[PDB]
RNA sequence: UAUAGGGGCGAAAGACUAAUCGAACCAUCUAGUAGCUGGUUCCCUCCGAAGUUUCCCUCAGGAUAGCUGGCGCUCUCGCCCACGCAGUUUUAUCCGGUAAAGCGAAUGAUUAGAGGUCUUGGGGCCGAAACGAUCUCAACCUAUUCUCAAACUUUAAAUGGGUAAGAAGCCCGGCUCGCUGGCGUGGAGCCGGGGUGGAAUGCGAGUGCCUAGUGGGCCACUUUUGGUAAGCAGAACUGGC
RNA sequence: AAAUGGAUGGCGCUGGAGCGUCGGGCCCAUACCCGGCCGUCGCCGGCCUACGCCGCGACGAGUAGGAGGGCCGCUGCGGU
RNA sequence: CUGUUUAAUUAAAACAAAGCAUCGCGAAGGCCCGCGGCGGGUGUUGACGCGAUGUGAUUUCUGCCCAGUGCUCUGAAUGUCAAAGUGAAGAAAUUCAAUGAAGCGCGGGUAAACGGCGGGAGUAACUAUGACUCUCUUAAGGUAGCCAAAUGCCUCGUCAU
RNA sequence: GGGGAGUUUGACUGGGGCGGUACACCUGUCAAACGGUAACGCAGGUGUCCUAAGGCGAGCUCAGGGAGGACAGAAACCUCCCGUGGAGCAGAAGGGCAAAAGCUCGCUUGAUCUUGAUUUUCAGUACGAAUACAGACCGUGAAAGCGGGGCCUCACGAUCCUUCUGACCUUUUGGGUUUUAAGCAGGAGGUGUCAGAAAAGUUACCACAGGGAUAACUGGCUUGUGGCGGCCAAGCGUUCAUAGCGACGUCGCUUUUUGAUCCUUCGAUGUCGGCUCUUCCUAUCAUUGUGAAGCAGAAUUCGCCAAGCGUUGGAUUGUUC
RNA sequence: GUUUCCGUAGUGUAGUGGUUAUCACGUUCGCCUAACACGCGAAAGGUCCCCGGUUCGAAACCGGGCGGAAACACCA
RNA sequence: UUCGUUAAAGA
RNA sequence: GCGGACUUAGCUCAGUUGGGAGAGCGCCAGACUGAAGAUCUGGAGGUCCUGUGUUCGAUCCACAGAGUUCGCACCA
RNA sequence: GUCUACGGCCAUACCACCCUGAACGCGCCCGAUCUCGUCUGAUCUCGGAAGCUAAGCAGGGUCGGGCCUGGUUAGUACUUGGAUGGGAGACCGCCUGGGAAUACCGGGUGCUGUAGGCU
């Protein structure tokens, strides 16, 4: 009863934002795209040719096959069961990196550099990343000035 | 035409007229300024408006009630160019009329459920001012009356305010005498031009 | 005769009365779904492999291990 | 709409692109002692009136203009069909159209 | 005495035809069929729902998926540290275009005043007529100003969705390729070796088969569509009957 | 201003048994804690009906439905 | 009119009726029964008869339309039209071609057969009313009569009693 | 050939029918910033069109505005400047597009054959549509590359049967040849109720199994409509707003009308009016006691306490009226 | 109320298969006649219901109103 | 073959 | 789907064993009459439904198609 | 301190107007016989090199328009979760958390990779 079609709800999705129409750059198509990488969805208005659907702008997943001009992508979609790993072909213009992953590989390097020197010169570490601590008893200042007085102010329309 | 007590506080979208309306007949009011309209700024110093209390709904014929019996307790107060009143407040919301009995069962149901378009009403925002009169800075009570006649005709409760500003401008009414002498306000005709520092030399060139 | 029409009420709570599932378990991914000229890249590098890395690796294990 | 009369279209007997005369698929006259004509005439045979039943409520104005396209090449004869979409009016190979054209009406 | 059942007979009401006639009676097929009413017989223990997706001449029904039970199987804790999981949070990383706000920003509406002068159109005025010249209205432009928009928008929340937080991961060395190709170039596969202390909290997990009932729902805080409103009709999250 | 006579539940209540802000005590549910007993489940002990005997701990509602136990019961058959 | 009928909710304006009409039939026949026979009813009958219909005494009339649907007459001069029969090709099954019996169509009649019968505009010494005229129109355009009727929504139509 | 026989009369539906298709597929909103998410919700569509409006390459920039130029004017043709999409892209909208996906020109049918994978609806079934590949034969371009229909979102169809196409294919039954028939693979003939039965009406002579899942009485929620009050006062009242009235606006009450819904009632609550009879309310027609008038008297009008008692006989219509 | 259809000179109309102002009656002028009717030849007379969108171009294609003409409004 | 009308009076 | 019939001037029609378009009613202008009608004379008006093929030449021959109509048959 | 060829980020780098430009380079320019395509050597191609920075171009400037960023707006409008909070409703207040935008004001206006040449 609403006529489920393809991209029935794409108004804004895509589209491109404001004062970025016009041709593709370039960097988008010249990146590294091998096995394995994380990489995020964001459609295109621009090529028609390689829009995946409407449920999965947005979506983050990995690739498992690459080709001439597009890539594979396996996906997590949830649906009214269970969610499901999708494989789906995707044009390299809907595709960006996911930088977390980067920045997990950067606190790998950093343990590893870490335990070189725990190992090199007996040193205890604590690589483990603990949240944020509650505020050690610290001091404060209070010289020059006296505290400034506040007061709340009358009502005025 | 339905009293107002079936059309009053906001359940639905605001559905104007559009290219998807397409049937609303013309509002009540059409004019929106009744006093001295060529009037400068210099010339009345104050003005009272009027600021709404409740999130209702205003007819247009609300509206037009109102509008004359301000006007008429104006000229009979302080006569015709002594005042310049202005409506702030414009309709756009068109409610909708599903009417039966066209004394039996045997025509319509529930059926066709989707309404014809009745007439406009006004939205108002808690705050939003209904009406605001500039004067002299002996009537300041006349502008109160006035008001004071208009309230009771509106529905719902409803304040009147003397406002700080120096009539229909954004500027206060005490930095308004000290400030357009000096560097900045230049009158054009009713409204006031605020001019930057961020112009062309040009202009200050024509200034002075 | 009207009957109440579509509704996605009570829903939610049915798909957690069992636990929402990730597949969850994939070791050595799927093969199929990949270009067929990768195929005939890959499949063909394996047989070779079958076929021919036995005395060019095993020397080289041997020189590993006497330097380990 | 307009197809040409000849067109060069991979046909499957040689393996290249060869020209082919473009002609129009008559449905064809259908052939008696087949076996669902001779089974339909036994079983109609027999005081039962109307076995199998008959087509009624038609909604369909058009129909699928299929081509035969034959094979131009001397001993070849490649013979197979290509369908179009469906259209109401049907020309069968002439009367292109210019641009430059008045519209004299 | 004659007319005997889809027949008789009817000055016609479809009336009469053995208390039955818009198709008599008796027996048989026949325990006809029914998605439709009513009913369905001892105790205790354990677990325990749904009125929803899709399809059907489907809408009082059924099939399928979901919710549920039963039967197990594969493993794991039980003697500085295992794997895994989550209606949860944190750390990053992307996604949106709703509330809001705006329209002196595009689209669409809409109010009033001012300044400017190319323009054609209404008036009288300098006067044989004359873009020779004067005033005003008309319209246009400029800079303002009033009020909005579910099918407008530059900006853009809160809430929310996906991903990663390791031994299936890093690093090194080498073989294969009919893929690719300036190049032992790239990319995949295979082999060998080295280091597990890698966010918070909680939890022992994975998996196979068979199947009942369900497929008429309702109410409440909040977000909402039609209606004047309804103990009205229809949606979303959560909870309850 | 509405139709039988009637509803802060009624009775009554004004230095309150009304209204708004509050303080200290007090009353109880199958809610919570401790304890006795039954049952289910989990983990376990023993070379004492092994289908029995103990040990510890946590929980027990429920229509449609699905299982387990019955030294519940009726009728008849072979053993006893 | 006398008569008859919904026995057990109707007694009638209902049915029947004489009168008026129409059609089929000269017996190897008209209308019917029967599973069957040249078997039966009308028929021990013969157009002043039998069978089938509409209207319903007497008086006065039976308006106009065969466009439609039926019925009926007429012709191989003539389209279409099934078996069987004919001709050709082939090894044969089979295919093709001509000829064509009824029916339909083509032509006529039939309304005491089913049935049907108009809306506009302008026009006469005050006004209305409008004999009259013009236009589109069908097959024919409601004629003689009758009426707010047992038939008229507006309607408790208007006037008189 | 209704003389007789058998069978059918789609579904949704604020009861049924008529009306409509919300029955198949699209666009934007509802839709609450992932996605999904309803109604006979809203605004608009579709059963087509195209041998080019497909594919490639090259060249050029549109709509509009200003200034000029013989006839020439508001619009005939040319030139210069401004010109970010204000035009066009086949059609309903949304997105997107400027040495372009737009206009013009030149060649060409890739709108070709074939096996898998994936996305969409979804049960992760099918059809339809789409995407990335792969293998042949090609088009264009100098090459890069692009192209296996339309810039994307829709524009379409199962089993059985028929017809056509293909192998120098298989079986035609004891063995050969030949005609024929059957099969294999893929196009068409079509199921618009669009996952697909082949289907007219009436029953007031009706029957059966059921439903208050579902109308026609009352009662229940609401008060649109009806009726009855109030608020501010522009005016009527010779003067004078409020003795009596009161527009333009606005707030309410009641269920004596009507409407909306379907909550109970379908193994039945006997469904209009009249007669007789009892009781209750006040929003008072009269009577008792009062206030105010444009209350001279009389007669009236507007209010208060007030329901104790009265509130007719008839012609008409079945009447309520 | 719902579904179809129509609106054009003073009057009844034709005309879209987009790009006109068509026919007939009526008015005015002049002729034939002694003069009228009749007849003739011209002329004027159009907001193609009003307001908007599509395009090079609308009355025509579409929409919102305006005013009409047919059909239905049944069971309780 | 067809061709309509012209009052009241006026000798 | 099969067989067969009709498309001509503004209207109704004619026209083969093919050398090609006419009759009547229409329109216009003359004459006749005191005027009209009839009559006489002189003009204007055919895309013969469309495309192709044979012939030197096709309205007439054939094929295909487009509107109208007549019967006939109906497995999805 | 620069430019040229190819670029990446796509206005901090676009638009209007005014000044500056030594040397390589970019260009305007100088003509159609061959390659070339036009109505036109105007556009595109062919071998130049007499002048010129007038223009493009490269810098700078405008209390410049725009663009980016920062205050203000504002802990406001909104908003997850809660109450036997208020009010007849309309809505509003409180606890716990998150937190936007226009006006108004202030500052900037290109950064770079590869290959090559001038001072
Ligand atoms: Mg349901
Ligand atoms: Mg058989
Ligand atoms: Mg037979
Ligand atoms: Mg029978
Ligand atoms: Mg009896
Ligand atoms: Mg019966
Ligand atoms: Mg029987
Ligand atoms: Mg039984
Ligand atoms: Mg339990
Ligand atoms: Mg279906
Ligand atoms: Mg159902
Ligand atoms: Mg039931
Ligand atoms: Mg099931
Ligand atoms: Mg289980
Ligand atoms: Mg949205
Ligand atoms: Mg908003
Ligand atoms: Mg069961
Ligand atoms: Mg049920
Ligand atoms: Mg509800
Ligand atoms: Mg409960
Ligand atoms: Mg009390
Ligand atoms: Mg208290
Ligand atoms: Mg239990
Ligand atoms: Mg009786
Ligand atoms: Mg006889
Ligand atoms: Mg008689
Ligand atoms: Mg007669
Ligand atoms: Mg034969
Ligand atoms: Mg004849
Ligand atoms: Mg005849
Ligand atoms: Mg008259
Ligand atoms: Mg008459
Ligand atoms: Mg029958
Ligand atoms: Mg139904
Ligand atoms: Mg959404
Ligand atoms: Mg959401
Ligand atoms: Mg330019
Ligand atoms: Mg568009
Ligand atoms: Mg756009
Ligand atoms: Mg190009
Ligand atoms: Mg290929
Ligand atoms: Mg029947
Ligand atoms: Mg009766
Ligand atoms: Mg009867
Ligand atoms: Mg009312
Ligand atoms: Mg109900
Ligand atoms: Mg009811
Ligand atoms: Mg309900
Ligand atoms: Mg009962
Ligand atoms: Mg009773
Ligand atoms: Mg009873
Ligand atoms: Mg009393
Ligand atoms: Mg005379
Ligand atoms: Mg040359
Ligand atoms: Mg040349
Ligand atoms: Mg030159
Ligand atoms: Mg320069
Ligand atoms: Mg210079
Ligand atoms: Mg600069
Ligand atoms: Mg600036
Ligand atoms: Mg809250
Ligand atoms: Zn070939």
Request: glycine share 8%.
């Amino acid at each position: 009863t609403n006529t489920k079609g393809k991209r029935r709800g794409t108004r804004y999705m895509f589209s491109r934002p404001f004062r970025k129409h016009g041709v593709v750059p370039l960097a988008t198509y010249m990146r590294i795209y091998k096995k394995g990488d994380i990489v995020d969805i964001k459609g295109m208005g621009t090529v028609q040719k390689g829009m995946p659907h409407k449920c999965y702008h947005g979506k983050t997943g990995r690739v498992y096959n690459v080709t001439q001009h597009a890539v594979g992508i396996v996906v997590n979609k949830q649906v009214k069961g269970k969610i499901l790993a999708k494989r789906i072909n995707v044009r390299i213009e809907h595709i960006k990196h996911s930088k977390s992953r980067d920045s997990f590989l950067k606190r790998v390097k950093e343990n590893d550099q870490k335990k070189k020197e725990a190992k090199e010169k007996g040193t205890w570490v604590q690589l483990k990343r603990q949240p944020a601590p509650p505020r050690e008893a610290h001091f404060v200042r209070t010289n020059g000035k006296e505290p400034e007085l506040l007061e709340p102010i009358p009502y005025e329309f | 035409r339905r009293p107002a007590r079936c059309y009053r506080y906001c359940k639905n979208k605001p559905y104007p007229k559009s290219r998807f309306c397409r049937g609303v007949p013309d509002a009540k009011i059409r004019i929106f300024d009744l006093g001295r309209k060529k009037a400068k700024v210099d010339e009345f110093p104050l003005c009272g408006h009027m600021v709404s209390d409740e999130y209702e709904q205003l007819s247009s014929e609300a509206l037009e009630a109102a509008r004359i019996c301000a006007n008429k307790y104006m000229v009979k107060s302080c006569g015709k160019d002594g005042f310049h009143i202005r409506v702030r407040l414009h309709p756009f919301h068109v409610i909708r009329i599903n009417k039966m009995l066209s004394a039996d069962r045997l025509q319509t149901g529930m059926r066709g459920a989707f309404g014809k378009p009745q007439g406009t009403v006004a939205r108002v925002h808690i705050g939003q001012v209904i009406m605001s009169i500039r004067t002299k800075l002996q009537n300041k009570e006349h502008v109160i009356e006035a008001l004071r006649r208009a309230k009771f005709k509106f529905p719902g409760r409803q304040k009147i305010h003397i406002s700080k500003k120096w009539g229909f401008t954004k500027f206060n009414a005490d930095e308004f005498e000290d400030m357009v002498a000096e560097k900045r306000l230049i009158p054009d005709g009713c409204g006031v031009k605020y001019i930057p520092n961020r112009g062309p030399l040009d202009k200050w060139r024509a200034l002075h | 005769a009207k009957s109440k029409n579509h509704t996605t009420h009570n829903q939610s709570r049915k798909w957690h009365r069992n636990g929402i599932k990730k597949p969850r378990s994939q070791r050595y991914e799927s093969l199929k779904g990949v270009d067929p000229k990768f195929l005939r890249n890959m499949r063909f590098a394996k047989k070779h492999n079958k076929k021919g890395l036995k005395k060019m690796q095993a020397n080289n294990a041997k020189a590993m291990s006497a330097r380990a | 709409v307009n197809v040409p009369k000849t067109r060069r279209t991979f046909c499957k007997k040689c393996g290249k692109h060869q020209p082919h005369k473009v002609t129009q698929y008559k449905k064809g006259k259908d052939s008696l002692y087949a076996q669902g004509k001779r089974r339909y005439d036994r079983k109609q045979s027999g005081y039962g009136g109307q076995t199998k039943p008959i087509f009624r409520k038609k909604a369909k104005t058009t129909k699928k203009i299929v081509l035969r396209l034959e094979c131009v090449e001397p001993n070849c004869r490649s013979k197979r069909m290509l369908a179009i979409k469906r259209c109401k009016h049907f020309e069968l190979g002439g009367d292109k159209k210019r641009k430059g054209q008045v519209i004299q009406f």
